[PDB]
Structures are given as C-alpha cells and as structure tokens.
Write a protein that binds this ligand. Sequence first.
Ligand code: PLM
Ligand code: CL
Ligand code: CL
Length: 174
Amino acid sequence: ERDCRVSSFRVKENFDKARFSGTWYAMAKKDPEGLFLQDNIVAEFSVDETGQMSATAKGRVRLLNNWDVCADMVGTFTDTEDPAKFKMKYWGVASFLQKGNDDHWIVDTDYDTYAVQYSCRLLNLDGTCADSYSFVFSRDPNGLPPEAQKIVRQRQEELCLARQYRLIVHNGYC
Ligand SMILES: CCCCCCCCCCCCCCCC(=O)O
Ligand SMILES: [Cl-]
Ligand SMILES: [Cl-]
C-alpha cells in the first residue's frame, strides 16, 4: 500500500541550517551496505556566514579483522533546490578513512530535541532505494522524550525503514 519511492518522501519544510547547528548524538542508525560508523557516533553541525553548512563526526568504526578505531570525519554540504536536501562530500582526517559523496536529507527535526536524517545512495529501478542509510539524532545523549520518540517512529515508517534500525550506544569509547 504505502509508497516507498524515494521521490515520494517528505522532508523538513523551510529547513533552518542555523537552528540545526551544534551537537547531535546518534541514537539509532539504519546501516547501508558496507557499514562504516558503528557506535559512539556524535556529530557537530555548523553554518558559516555564506550560509554553507558543514559538519564533523566522531565514532567507532571497525575495519575488518576487527580492528577498532575512533574515526574522525568531516563533511561539507552543497545546497539543492530543496532547503532540506543536500549533497554531502565527506572524508576522514586520516587519508585512509572512507571518503565519498552522499545525498543528505533532513527528513524531520524540531531543532532542539530530535532529527531524522536519510540518504539513498542508489535507487532501485522502481524508484525505491536499493542502498539507504538513516540516522536518528538526539540533542540529549540520554535519548529522546516520548513525544519525540513517537514522531520519529512515524517518520521511520514513512521512509520504509522502521524495522531496520539498531540502537547506537555511547560509552566514552572515543
Ligand atoms: C551523516 C553524518 C551526519 C554528519 C556527519 C557527516 C560527517 C561525515 C559523516 C560520515 C558519514 C558517512 C558514513 C555514513 C554511512 C555509515 O556510517 O555507514
Ligand atoms: Cl511508541
Ligand atoms: Cl519494527
């Protein structure tokens, strides 16, 4: 019944980069293929005077043969015609860390409590996403209040992802 075409997904009306700035703790993640950020994931968003949004992120990543490292990542956002949809160029402070460019959508936020982010890296031929990821962020590292949690679950369902998240732990690893 429900529409899982990426082109159908609503995103945050009138998204305000300035209001979104500061520290966001990842509470939950839906992983893409070949997942990178594992846990202890914390993002820091900024906007400069030209209106350009950027971010940094810290988190544990586990490169194969199970060698744990705290990745330190950088992202810069190019605006599109939709104020809530961006192209995110990203890299690690270390050369060998994963680099790339992903769509970055702010699906919903109330700026001071919760945010839902979404990226489709590759479409299916029917317009659904073949390879997606999604973060749920909280301003409080101890989690969302119930009213926000309930809104977020609705958005997760609207993205056709609600069954596919895992919780992100924070335990000072970094
Ligand atoms: C999506 C992060 C929010 C802002 C932080 C962007 C700074 C670089 C983030 C790198 C994330 C790229 C990896 C996401 C997919 C994954 O973790 O498996
Ligand atoms: Cl609930
Ligand atoms: Cl579920």
